[PDB]
Design a protein that fits this description.
The structure is a homotetramer of 216-residue chains. Chain A is built from 3 helices and 17 strands. Chain A has 216 residues and is mainly beta. Chain A has 2 domains: 110 residues, Sandwich (Immunoglobulin-like); 105 residues, Immunoglobulins (Immunoglobulin-like). In chain A, strands 2, 3, 6, 7 and 8 form a 5-stranded antiparallel beta sheet that branches. In chain A, strands 11, 12, 15, 16 and 17 form a 5-stranded antiparallel beta sheet that branches. A 4-stranded antiparallel beta sheet of chain A has the order 9-10-14-13. Chain A is elongated. Chains A and B meet through α2, β10 and β14 of A and loops of B. The PDB classes it as immunoglobulin. Keywords: immunoglobulin.
Amino acid sequence: QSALTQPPSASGSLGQSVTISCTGTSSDVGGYNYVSWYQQHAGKAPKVIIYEVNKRPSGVPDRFSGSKSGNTASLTVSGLQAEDEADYYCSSYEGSDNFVFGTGTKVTVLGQPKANPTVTLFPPSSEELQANKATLVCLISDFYPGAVTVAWKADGSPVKAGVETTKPSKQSNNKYAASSYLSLTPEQWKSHRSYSCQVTHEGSTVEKTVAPTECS
Amino acid sequence: QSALTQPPSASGSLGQSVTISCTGTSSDVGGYNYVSWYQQHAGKAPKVIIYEVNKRPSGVPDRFSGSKSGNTASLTVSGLQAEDEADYYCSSYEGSDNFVFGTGTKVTVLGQPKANPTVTLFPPSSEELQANKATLVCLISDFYPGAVTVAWKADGSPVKAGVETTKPSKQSNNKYAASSYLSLTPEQWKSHRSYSCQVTHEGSTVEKTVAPTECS
Amino acid sequence: QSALTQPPSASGSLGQSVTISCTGTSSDVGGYNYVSWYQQHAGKAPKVIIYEVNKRPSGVPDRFSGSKSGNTASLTVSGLQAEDEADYYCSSYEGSDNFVFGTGTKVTVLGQPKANPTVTLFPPSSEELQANKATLVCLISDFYPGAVTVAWKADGSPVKAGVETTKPSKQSNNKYAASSYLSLTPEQWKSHRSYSCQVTHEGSTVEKTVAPTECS
Amino acid sequence: QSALTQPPSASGSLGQSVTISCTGTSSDVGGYNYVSWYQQHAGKAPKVIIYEVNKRPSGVPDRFSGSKSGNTASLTVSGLQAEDEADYYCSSYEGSDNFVFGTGTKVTVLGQPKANPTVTLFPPSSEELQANKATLVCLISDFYPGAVTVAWKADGSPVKAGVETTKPSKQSNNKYAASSYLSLTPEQWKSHRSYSCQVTHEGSTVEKTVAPTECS
């Protein structure tokens, strides 16, 4: 369906203002005047915090803003101490036996660290070399801002047919951790050059390449 | 506060029919209509799936209605389909632009086969150990239920303050499984005798010890 | 033969919602409509209670609908009301004047309070015994569940080939209880020491012995 | 609602023809041309055996008849060996968010005896004279044709406010048995003259009177 184009996590420094945008089509969000922005303060009941454009229900606060920028719907939060710490959802109204929601701009800043992802790439074992099950597993410990873009490449170009990514979590301090792994035939492996696991941030990134070969 | 009464949890089969009950004030669901429901599954953005009272866009197969007796507004999926089970929610106009919604349900639907669990662990590359440490990662690829525990054993005894786990899953509408990680350097590693991961799951315990696999 | 698939038994509460599923050939419920349902409770004459597919005359409060996904035509009572529990049935035109109907359901609805049982036995008039026999009759007036047994004891020991019982009930939408009868003449009577009726019911046993009551 | 006026049990002698009638109003059954007559061969799925007037589905037999006698709807069964042994239901179509069913003319003849009801009347006990609970219980053993009209009178005239009648049954040979009892204050009892329990057949009847009074 639609996508209502939303960055992943917006990560300020308390006493801040962010803009979350929401691109759709030109029809809706563009011409159309009905955008809605809700808040799931750690999921559950994402409340309507913004409706119409910059309109606001009653049992929702101030500090809370939003515009219909001739093609992008944007919410501007301007404070953010112990308010934005929510999942944020942008929704586009329209008359098609539907009405659009977008992707999840989640907010926080309450943590300690906004330190980086720790990735490693464990290319296939003997599960693969013998057991013939070609699994390269790409791992990410010690996060702080839990945001995991990951993209794999197959020798040069994108790769993504039989690859999974474990929605993330990590205890102890919290931080965050997660995985992404790919499973195919041996050869698809040993016949092939290299696999890349690049988790991404904005002012973050880390890339990694595992390549085929031999034993002792 | 404007809450929408609805149970926190639903159950059923896939042979008969399920009904979630969204109840409120005559204000919201008494003398007003405009009860929309959304299909959310923790991570995709909620889907309008009965609007007004029982009006439904491509997504309602058919007997996936809702109607509102008095102010007790129940949506029924007649039949029931092996979907994923999580959150359904109802919002009504409660009028003066201040929409409100009942939370919950989720589901307990037989008609999805329990699975058994499939492990992959990949401590290696084949240097890892001569030069530093790498780290041990265990991956249960799958098994339906999502009700488990993993331990790791160093030739017979659990090592300690040397373990990190937590997640249920991802997948699409398939299963639930996660991955464990221990840092064990070299001798911490092999000096360690040999390592099984111990997947105690639903009365069946499964597990793989790994020793000399070398390079894959 | 033209049968209408529907479960033989339904269950639920009175807090949520129940759905009975009437499924058949596209002939009946595929490309034809005209699925009517009747509320029968073993003794009153069945009541049309969703006609065509979800059209309903005074009797449907409201969310007491039915809809037909594909040919799986489910009727939902949203809410559910402490009714009596027994038979619901669906008939569709299956066209060429040869209507057909699914049988069953009945119900298992919490939301009706179990009762305890209340006995009355009346062997007498006050001559009965000097002149012939009369007969012993025991009446449990009531108690909700309807899951029991009655014995009769002649000062401690069950007499034999001297007993007749069987029934669940009547009442309106209240309870279930019945009445026992033993013919015991005179001496067969008092020569008999004294008679308790023994109502073994749902883990609680209740019972009344009767001796000298004389005339009432 | 309606009543669709139907005698209770029609009781031939095999190789016979009976007429079951169905009076309603003048509107329906009268003018109206839609009567329907179904068969519950010991309950469950009462099939449509007659529709329109004398029209008959396909998987139903011959021997089976029915007319729309300008105000009474009648079915004439003409054979009856091992066919009529059913509950029989007369139904009147009409356009009032309804469609009428009538009362239950049940059929049989397969038995041994078409012998009479055995009634007794156990007027209040000490439950009543002391316990102050005024219960006169009217009992009917050894039936063959299970048909129990019962009517109580209070000194002369009808009586029926707090009186029950246990839908009937009896094991051993079968036959049939049942009860009917009345519960009121002592005085309503001892202040009052007499209570009558008349079970009725057609070419049957039995009447019984219990009157108030004293002990030893």
